[PDB]
């Protein structure tokens, strides 16, 4: 809790970081690596939600103009889920945290990339892309403590 408060103060979104870390039993005892791992899991949950939302849209007779955006968003979230976040978990757990930082930079940029495909028009899961981006930037800040 005092570790959590200190850690969260040194992120771009204090209350988001607080709610996320304190949602997980592991924070009430976990060290800073543990806090990073909790944040990775939060990003993971939102990325899985986005991946499924994209599949639903793509199978629901979407507007023709969303064909490219949605295909590239699906690719974006597949990178996050199969590469960026598994890389961060492994690196935090048993390796070099620099690679977890890379993973968070990746997921932050990939969620932003997906959102920006809908520029000029309605973005159908905007809040979700924003959530993944903001949580990634919080995680990046947390992991920076280990570097």
């Amino acid at each position: 809790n005092n570790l959590v408060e200190t850690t969260c103060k040194n992120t771009p979104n204090y209350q988001l970081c607080l709610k996320t870390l304190l949602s997980d039993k592991r924070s009430a005892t976990g060290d800073i690596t543990t806090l990073a791992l909790i944040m990775v899991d939060a990003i993971k949950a939102k990325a899985n939600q986005a991946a499924v939302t994209i599949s639903k849209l793509r199978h629901s007779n979407p507007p023709a103009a969303w064909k490219g955006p949605l295909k590239n968003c699906a690719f974006s979230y597949k990178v996050i889920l199969t590469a960026s976040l598994p890389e961060a978990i492994e690196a935090l757990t048993k390796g070099d945290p620099k690679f977890a930082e890379d993973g968070m930079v990746g997921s932050s940029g990939d969620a932003q990339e997906c959102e920006e495909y809908f520029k000029g028009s309605k973005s159908p899961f905007s809040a979700l892309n924003i959530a993944v981006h903001e949580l990634s930037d919080v995680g990046r800040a947390i992991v920076r403590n280990l570097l």
Side-chain angles (χ1 to χ4, degrees), residues 19-28 34 37-38 41:
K19 194 191 165 74
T20 304
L21 296 182
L22 298 176
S23 282
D24 195 306
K25 52 164 183 91
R26 295 180 285 168
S27 62
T34 295
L37 293 168
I38 292 166
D41 285 354

Short mmCIF file of all heavy atoms in Angstrom, two decimals, residues 19-28 34 37-38 41:
data_model
loop_
_atom_site.label_atom_id
_atom_site.label_comp_id
_atom_site.label_asym_id
_atom_site.label_seq_id
_atom_site.Cartn_x
_atom_site.Cartn_y
_atom_site.Cartn_z
N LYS A 19 -6.16 1.73 -8.50
CA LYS A 19 -7.32 0.84 -8.62
C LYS A 19 -6.88 -0.54 -9.15
O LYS A 19 -7.30 -1.59 -8.63
CB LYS A 19 -8.37 1.47 -9.55
CG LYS A 19 -9.75 0.79 -9.49
CD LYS A 19 -10.69 1.27 -10.63
CE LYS A 19 -11.94 0.35 -10.82
NZ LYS A 19 -12.97 0.52 -9.74
N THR A 20 -6.02 -0.53 -10.16
CA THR A 20 -5.51 -1.74 -10.79
C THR A 20 -4.68 -2.62 -9.85
O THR A 20 -4.86 -3.84 -9.79
CB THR A 20 -4.71 -1.36 -12.05
OG1 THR A 20 -5.55 -0.59 -12.92
CG2 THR A 20 -4.19 -2.60 -12.78
N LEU A 21 -3.75 -2.01 -9.12
CA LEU A 21 -2.85 -2.77 -8.29
C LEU A 21 -3.59 -3.28 -7.07
O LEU A 21 -3.40 -4.44 -6.66
CB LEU A 21 -1.61 -1.97 -7.88
CG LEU A 21 -0.68 -1.55 -9.03
CD1 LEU A 21 0.53 -0.79 -8.50
CD2 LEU A 21 -0.23 -2.75 -9.89
N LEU A 22 -4.45 -2.44 -6.50
CA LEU A 22 -5.18 -2.80 -5.28
C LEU A 22 -6.35 -3.75 -5.55
O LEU A 22 -6.94 -4.29 -4.62
CB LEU A 22 -5.68 -1.54 -4.57
CG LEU A 22 -4.57 -0.58 -4.10
CD1 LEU A 22 -5.20 0.67 -3.49
CD2 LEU A 22 -3.59 -1.24 -3.12
N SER A 23 -6.68 -3.94 -6.81
CA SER A 23 -7.64 -4.96 -7.21
C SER A 23 -7.10 -6.39 -7.05
O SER A 23 -7.88 -7.34 -7.05
CB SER A 23 -8.04 -4.76 -8.67
OG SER A 23 -8.97 -3.70 -8.82
N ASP A 24 -5.78 -6.52 -6.92
CA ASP A 24 -5.09 -7.81 -6.97
C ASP A 24 -4.45 -8.12 -5.62
O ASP A 24 -3.66 -7.32 -5.11
CB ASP A 24 -4.03 -7.75 -8.07
CG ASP A 24 -3.51 -9.11 -8.46
OD1 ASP A 24 -3.06 -9.87 -7.57
OD2 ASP A 24 -3.53 -9.43 -9.66
N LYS A 25 -4.77 -9.29 -5.06
CA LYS A 25 -4.24 -9.74 -3.76
C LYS A 25 -2.73 -9.63 -3.64
O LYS A 25 -2.20 -9.41 -2.55
CB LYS A 25 -4.64 -11.22 -3.49
CG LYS A 25 -4.26 -12.17 -4.65
CD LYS A 25 -4.27 -13.65 -4.28
CE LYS A 25 -3.82 -14.50 -5.50
NZ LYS A 25 -2.34 -14.75 -5.53
N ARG A 26 -2.05 -9.81 -4.77
CA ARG A 26 -0.61 -9.90 -4.81
C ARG A 26 0.09 -8.59 -4.48
O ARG A 26 1.29 -8.59 -4.23
CB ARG A 26 -0.15 -10.35 -6.20
CG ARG A 26 -0.58 -11.76 -6.59
CD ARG A 26 -0.08 -12.12 -7.96
NE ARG A 26 -0.84 -11.45 -9.01
CZ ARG A 26 -0.47 -11.42 -10.29
NH1 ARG A 26 0.64 -12.02 -10.70
NH2 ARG A 26 -1.23 -10.78 -11.17
N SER A 27 -0.64 -7.47 -4.53
CA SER A 27 -0.07 -6.15 -4.24
C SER A 27 0.13 -5.98 -2.74
O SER A 27 1.14 -5.41 -2.31
CB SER A 27 -0.98 -5.04 -4.75
OG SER A 27 -2.24 -5.06 -4.10
N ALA A 28 -0.83 -6.48 -1.97
CA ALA A 28 -0.75 -6.48 -0.53
C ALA A 28 0.29 -7.48 -0.06
O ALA A 28 -0.04 -8.42 0.66
CB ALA A 28 -2.13 -6.82 0.07
N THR A 34 6.31 -7.55 -8.77
CA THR A 34 4.97 -8.07 -8.66
C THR A 34 3.98 -7.05 -9.17
O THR A 34 3.04 -7.41 -9.84
CB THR A 34 4.65 -8.47 -7.23
OG1 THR A 34 5.51 -9.54 -6.87
CG2 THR A 34 3.18 -8.93 -7.05
N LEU A 37 3.96 -7.07 -12.86
CA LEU A 37 3.22 -8.25 -13.29
C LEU A 37 1.69 -8.12 -13.19
O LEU A 37 0.96 -8.55 -14.11
CB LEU A 37 3.73 -9.52 -12.56
CG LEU A 37 5.16 -9.95 -12.90
CD1 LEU A 37 5.64 -11.00 -11.91
CD2 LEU A 37 5.26 -10.48 -14.35
N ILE A 38 1.21 -7.50 -12.12
CA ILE A 38 -0.21 -7.22 -11.96
C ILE A 38 -0.68 -6.31 -13.10
O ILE A 38 -1.75 -6.56 -13.69
CB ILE A 38 -0.48 -6.54 -10.61
CG1 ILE A 38 -0.22 -7.52 -9.46
CG2 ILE A 38 -1.91 -6.05 -10.53
CD1 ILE A 38 -0.13 -6.85 -8.08
N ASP A 41 -1.00 -8.19 -16.41
CA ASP A 41 -2.28 -8.92 -16.40
C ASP A 41 -3.51 -8.03 -16.69
O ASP A 41 -4.45 -8.48 -17.37
CB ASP A 41 -2.48 -9.67 -15.09
CG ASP A 41 -1.64 -10.92 -15.00
OD1 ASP A 41 -0.95 -11.30 -16.00
OD2 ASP A 41 -1.67 -11.53 -13.91
#
